[PDB]
Structure 1
Amino acid sequence: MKIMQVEKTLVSTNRIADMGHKPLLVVWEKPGAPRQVAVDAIGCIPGDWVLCVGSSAAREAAGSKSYPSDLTIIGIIDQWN
């Protein structure tokens, strides 16, 4: 898992129906680092430090074994800087 900071929300209206209703967030390891998009399974605000899991675990973390995700937020770190 990686420690990442939530930057902003992301909306894709024509995304595939397999994505369900889950929201999407733009995350990076630090400001200026390469951007990635994660499925928000917790509900996070910009500036939050979050735990993100990839590989096949992200699919089940996002809701189902066949969910189309390779990066899912699974928790907010209590204290981090």
Structure 2
Amino acid sequence: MKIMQVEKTLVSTNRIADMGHKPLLVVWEKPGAPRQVAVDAIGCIPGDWVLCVGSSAAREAAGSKSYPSDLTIIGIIDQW
């Protein structure tokens, strides 16, 4: 897994219908790294340090085992 930091939120009005109702967040390693997008299964604010998992693991961690995802937030780090 990875230690990421949240920047902000992202909206796409036309997503496929299987993406459900879940939110999306922009995350990097450190400010200035390439930015990625994760589905948020916890509820996080900008400036948080979070744990991200990406694989079929991420598919099942966000929703069910056929969910269209490859990066999911699964926890908030207590101290970083």
| TM-score over 0.5 for the pair | yes
- Distance in structure 2 (CA, Å) of the matches to 1:63 and 1:20: 9
What is the distance in 1 between the residues matched to 2:5 and 2:56?
22
Unaligned runs of 5+ in 1: none
Alpha-carbon separation, structure 1, partners of 2:61 and 2:13: 22
Structure 1: distance between partners of 2:30 and 2:12: 24
Quote the Cα distance in structure 1 between the aligned partners of 2:53 and 2:73: 7
Query: Who is 1:29 aligned against?
Result: 29
% identity of equivalent residues: 100
Q: Deviations over 1:40-79 (max 9, x none)?
A: 0000000000000001100110010000000000000000
- Name the SS for the 2:60 alignment partner: helix
- How many Å apart are 1:39 and its aligned residue? 0.2
- In 2, distance between residues paired with 1:54 and 1:24? 14
Q: Residues of 2 paired with 1:47 and 1:32: CA distance?
A: 14
Aligned to 2:14: 14
Q: Following TM superposition, by how much is the alpha carbon of 1:20 offset from its aligned partner in structure 2, in angstroms?
A: 0.2
Could you list the structure 1 runs, at least 4 aligned residues long, displaced by more than 2 angstroms after superposition.
none
For each residue in 1:2-51, what CA deviation from the matched residue of structure 2 results, as whole angstroms up to 9, or x when unmatched? 00000000000001110000000000001000000000000000000000
3-state SS, counterpart of residue 51 of structure 2:
strand
